[PDB]
Design an enzyme around this catalytic site. Structure first.
Site, short mmCIF file in Angstrom:
data_model
loop_
_atom_site.label_atom_id
_atom_site.label_comp_id
_atom_site.label_asym_id
_atom_site.label_seq_id
_atom_site.Cartn_x
_atom_site.Cartn_y
_atom_site.Cartn_z
N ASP A 50 31.42 5.09 152.68
CA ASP A 50 33.20 4.53 153.04
C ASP A 50 33.56 6.43 153.73
OD1 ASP A 50 35.67 4.88 152.39
OD2 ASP A 50 35.42 5.38 150.22
N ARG A 71 40.16 10.40 155.70
CA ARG A 71 39.98 10.44 154.25
C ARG A 71 39.55 10.86 153.21
NH1 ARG A 71 38.51 6.83 150.27
NH2 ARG A 71 39.40 8.63 148.66
N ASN A 72 37.77 10.80 153.50
CA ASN A 72 37.22 11.49 152.92
C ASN A 72 36.23 13.10 153.17
OD1 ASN A 72 36.83 10.07 150.40
ND2 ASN A 72 35.57 8.35 151.13
N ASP A 108 32.65 13.07 150.11
CA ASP A 108 33.02 11.44 149.54
C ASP A 108 33.86 11.42 147.64
OD1 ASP A 108 33.79 8.57 148.65
OD2 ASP A 108 31.12 8.67 148.50
C1 LIG Z 1 34.46 17.98 143.62
C2 LIG Z 1 33.77 17.32 144.31
C3 LIG Z 1 32.97 16.96 143.49
C4 LIG Z 1 32.10 16.27 144.44
C5 LIG Z 1 32.86 15.91 145.94
C6 LIG Z 1 31.75 14.30 146.73
O1 LIG Z 1 32.10 14.88 148.10
N1 LIG Z 1 31.18 13.94 146.40
C7 LIG Z 1 30.29 13.31 147.25
C8 LIG Z 1 29.56 12.19 146.39
C9 LIG Z 1 28.04 11.59 147.62
C10 LIG Z 1 28.18 11.95 148.99
C11 LIG Z 1 28.76 13.04 149.20
C12 LIG Z 1 28.68 13.34 150.88
F1 LIG Z 1 27.00 12.31 151.13
F2 LIG Z 1 28.65 14.71 151.18
F3 LIG Z 1 29.50 12.70 151.70
C13 LIG Z 1 29.83 13.57 148.23
C14 LIG Z 1 34.09 16.26 146.61
C15 LIG Z 1 34.08 18.06 145.95
N2 LIG Z 1 35.24 17.88 146.12
C16 LIG Z 1 36.24 17.76 146.48
N3 LIG Z 1 37.50 16.77 145.81
C17 LIG Z 1 38.23 17.08 146.37
C18 LIG Z 1 38.52 15.52 145.30
C19 LIG Z 1 40.41 15.77 145.99
N4 LIG Z 1 40.89 14.67 145.31
C20 LIG Z 1 40.02 13.62 144.75
N5 LIG Z 1 38.61 13.99 144.48
C21 LIG Z 1 37.84 14.81 145.16
N6 LIG Z 1 39.00 18.09 147.26
C22 LIG Z 1 38.51 18.79 147.34
C23 LIG Z 1 36.93 18.64 147.20
C24 LIG Z 1 37.16 19.77 147.80
N7 LIG Z 1 38.02 20.69 148.67
N8 LIG Z 1 39.31 19.76 148.28
C25 LIG Z 1 40.29 20.20 148.67
#
Ligand SMILES: Cc1ccc(C(=O)Nc2cccc(C(F)(F)F)c2)cc1Nc1nc(-c2cncnc2)nc2c1cnn2C
Length: 272
Positions: free
Chosen positions: A130, A134-135, A148
């Site tokens: 994905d 946006r990610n 993600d």
């Molecule tokens: C809390 C959290 C939990 C999971 C992830 C996330 O990226 N998980 C993930 C899952 C599989 C693979 C990867 C990878 F590979 F790093 F890309 C990441 C990010 C976050 N952090 C954030 N989520 C979100 C966010 C926003 N809207 C919906 N969901 C999460 N916004 C964030 C952050 C940090 N800053 N901001 C502005």
């Protein structure tokens, strides 16, 4: 994964939705801003497996261009995934709200960072599936961090390689196709890929051989690279190592970016 005690976390504002919970902005104990995804009472076995599995994979990643995991809460309810916070937010909205404000070199640097994070994921045998602006999160140093957030669930047809749409073949090479779309998103300041075409019209155009045209003010080398990410034949696409190498060399010899691809105007304005 570090285990964080709940007394160290304060949820402040809802910022999104989780699969079985909410996503918050908060503070982690001087205090540090964090993003917090919760798993709320009633979650299923599968959701718990996916949630703690997500935490485990994120704890394994340690790279400049991958979102950093601060810790997890698994010993108390509700369970939580806690990451660093980026006040600049997601890259798509960021670019759309800052149209025309950066140099070509700044934009290409964002792409090099995204590519370096993706090369790391692919090397670790993690297929993203994905990848889209946006990610991607942007910090106060303009560093882009691959993330993600789950599906917006809207299926991202216009970011997805033909083989992944057609027969569910998701690999690092379908991620390379997505990366080419992200290159176009960055260079256009967040334009919608394919504009108003429907999902079926996008797939038809791709199968007929059409590709996105060059963004305005786009270095020739950058358009050439995104076009090669969109080869129908998966084996012919660059690997992420190739993409990182090319972008690094262009940045280090920045005169290389001054040669621009021709932009095809939709509108003719004639004046004397
Ligand atoms: C809390 C959290 C939990 C999971 C992830 C996330 O990226 N998980 C993930 C899952 C599989 C693979 C990867 C990878 F590979 F790093 F890309 C990441 C990010 C976050 N952090 C954030 N989520 C979100 C966010 C926003 N809207 C919906 N969901 C999460 N916004 C964030 C952050 C940090 N800053 N901001 C502005």
């Amino acid at each position: 994964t570090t285990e964080i005690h709940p007394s160290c976390v304060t949820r402040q504002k809802v910022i999104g939705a989780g699969e079985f919970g909410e996503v918050y902005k908060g503070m982690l104990k001087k205090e540090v801003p964090v993003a917090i995804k919760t798993l709320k009472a009633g979650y299923t076995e599968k959701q718990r497996v996916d949630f703690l599995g997500e935490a485990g994979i994120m704890g394994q990643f340690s790279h400049h261009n991958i979102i950093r995991l601060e810790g997890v809460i698994s010993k108390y309810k509700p369970m939580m995934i806690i990451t660093e916070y980026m006040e600049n937010g997601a890259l798509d909205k960021f670019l759309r709200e800052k149209d025309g404000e950066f140099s070509v070199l700044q934009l290409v640097g964002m792409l090099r960072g995204i590519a370096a994070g993706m090369k790391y994921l692919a090397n670790m045998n993690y297929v993203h599936r994905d990848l889209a602006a946006r990610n991607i999160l942007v910090n106060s140093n303009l560093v882009c961090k691959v993330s993600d957030f789950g599906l917006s669930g809207k299926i991202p047809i216009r970011w997805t390689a033909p083989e992944a749409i057609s027969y569910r073949k998701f690999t690092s090479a379908s991620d390379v196709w997505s990366f080419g779309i992200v290159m176009w998103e960055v260079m256009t300041y967040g334009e919608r890929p394919y504009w108003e075409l429907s999902n079926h019209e996008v797939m038809k155009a791709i199968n007929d051989g059409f590709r996105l045209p060059t963004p305005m003010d786009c270095p020739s080398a950058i358009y050439q690279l995104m076009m090669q990410c969109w080869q129908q034949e998966r084996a012919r696409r660059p690997k992420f190592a190739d993409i990182v190498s090319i972008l690094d060399k262009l940045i280090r010899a920045p005169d290389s970016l001054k040669t621009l691809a021709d932009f095809d105007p939709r509108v003719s304005i004639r004046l004397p």
